[PDB]
Amino acid sequence: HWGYGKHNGPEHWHKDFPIAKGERQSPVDIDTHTAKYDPSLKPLSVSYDQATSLRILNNGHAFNVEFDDSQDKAVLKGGPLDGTYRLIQFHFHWGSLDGQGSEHTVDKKKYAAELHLVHWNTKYGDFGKAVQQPDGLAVLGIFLKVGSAKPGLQKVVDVLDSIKTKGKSADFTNFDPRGLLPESLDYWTYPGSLTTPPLLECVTWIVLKEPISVSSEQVLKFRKLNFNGEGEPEELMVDNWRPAQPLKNRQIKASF
Ligand SMILES: NS(=O)(=O)c1cc(C(=O)O)c(NCc2ccco2)cc1Cl
Ligand SMILES: [Zn+2]
Ligand SMILES: [Zn+2]
Structure with a gap:
């Protein structure tokens, strides 16, 4: 029954998922003065032109x-990656107020939200197999700050009213995730994990430097979702972020 509350929040996860105190957990703070430019990184390739969305789901x-x-169809290649990784879903983490909500931080700065585009390594054949490998996933992370609206986001925020509670889904075809990318693909990369249980250490993180801007009204509609299921007392879906974890031996590399 893990979640983000006082009794089931991130400080509790290790009891059911002891890897929470592992050697390569995510997210982390990105200290821009310790991350080193790595000229050996190849150019990053985001090929989302043929992406086919299907559905949108409130998963609790x-x-x-x-x-x-x-x-x-929609793939991520290059940068630190070896081979081809297929897009399977995206989601966000966000806060109750604009001053918090991201998972990664940048010199301890917290953004209002963070977008995760999750991809799996097609050499392993299916997602389930990929999450048994130290290079099975790649997550593209993008910070959200509040300012001007992101037009490419509005189809997402407008469907949220139809999936208010846990377990609800809605059809969601032809959504183009290219509409959520910033101008620059400059990034930081490090090896890490899922930021939610089961917290598997199977992820190459690619975190973009440039945030996207979304409006106060768009993020306010994120905060109207519910953690709870239908007819249950209302628990607003806010602060669904894990705080920064120990970097341990790892090295964060910059592509720029
Ligand atoms: N927050 S996250 O981007 O680290 C993430 C978050 C989630 C999530 O379900 O919140 C997730 N679900 C699929 C899954 C199940 C086991 C391994 O990956 C995958 C990822 Cl990579
Ligand atoms: Zn859940
Ligand atoms: Zn995530």
């Missing part, structure tokens, strides 16, 4: 926009 901790990954 966030909402997933899910993609048909049965073929090689």
Whole structure:
């Protein structure tokens, strides 16, 4: 029954998922003065032109926009990655106030939200197999700050009213995730983990430097979602972020 409350929040996860205190947990704070430029990183390739969204789901901790990954449509390659990774879903983490909500931080700065585009390494054949490997996933993370609206986000925020509570889903076809990317693909990268249980240490993190801006009204509608299921007392879905974890031996590399 893990979650983000006082009794089931991130300081409790280790009891059911002892890897929470592992050697390569996420998220982390990105200290921009310790991260080193790595000229050996290859150019990053985000190929989302043929992405096919299917559905949007409130899963009790966030909402997933899910993609048909049965073929090689929307893929992420290059940068630190070896091979091809297929997009399977994206989701966000956000706070109750604009001063918090991201998972990664940048010189301890917290953004209002953070977008995660989750991809799995097609050499392992399916997602389930990929999450048994130290290079099975790649997550593209993008910070959200509040300012001007992101037009590319409005189809997402407008469907949220139809998936208010845990377990609800809605059809969500033809959504183009290219509409959520910033201008620059400059990034930081490090090896890490899922930020939610089961916290598997299977992820190459690629965190973009440039945030996207969304409006106060768009993030306010994120905060109207519910953690609870239908007819249950209302628990607003806010602060669904894990705080920064110990970097341990790892090295954060910059692509710029
Ligand atoms: N927050 S996150 O981007 O680290 C993340 C978050 C989630 C999530 O479900 O919140 C998730 N679900 C799929 C899954 C199940 C086991 C391994 O990956 C995958 C990822 Cl990578
Ligand atoms: Zn959940
Ligand atoms: Zn996430």
